[PDB]
Amino acid sequence: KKIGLFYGTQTGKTESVAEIIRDEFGNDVVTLHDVSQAEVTDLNDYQYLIIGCPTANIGELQSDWEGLYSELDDVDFNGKLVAYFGTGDQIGYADNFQDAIGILEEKISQRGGKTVGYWSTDGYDFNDSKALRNGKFVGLALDEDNQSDLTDDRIKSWVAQLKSEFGL
Known about the structure:
By secondary structure, the protein is of the alpha/beta class. It contains 4 helices and 9 strands. The chain has a single domain (1-168), classed as Flavodoxin domain (Rossmann fold). The chain is 27% helix and 20% strand. α1 crosses α4. It starts with a strand and ends with a helix. This is Flavodoxin. InterPro entries: Flavodoxin, Flavodoxin/NO_synth, Flavodoxin_CS, Flavodoxin_lc, Flavoprotein-like_sf. One of its GO terms (molecular function) is electron transfer activity.
């Protein structure tokens, strides 16, 4: 029970990338958890967390994560290392690209979680995002609508970055 990946999905893209990420951590255990099935206290079981949340079709949070969001204040993230990833349409959702993981990070960071895995904005075209931290994304930004050809390279580079951050 090494690394806990908790994701929500609307269409199934975030689920598929959750499996690729799990594969890319070759010598480590990444367990997968749909937050539609999970409780918020399951986050207590891991020191290493990867949070997957798509840019919401409607509102600012994917519905399942939206349900867990109000309960995050019951959990103490002090001492935990937390990485974030999300899918989004940088053209169709240009003013809200990756807002969800930006919102999730702000809360988890205030509860004590330490963010690792910041990701450059080079190669993205968007107007606004809540996931921006000093010119970088708070985590891996994937676009399957417009940049599905970059997804596998990006996941591979990001996981390699995380292994140096997680000490793997």
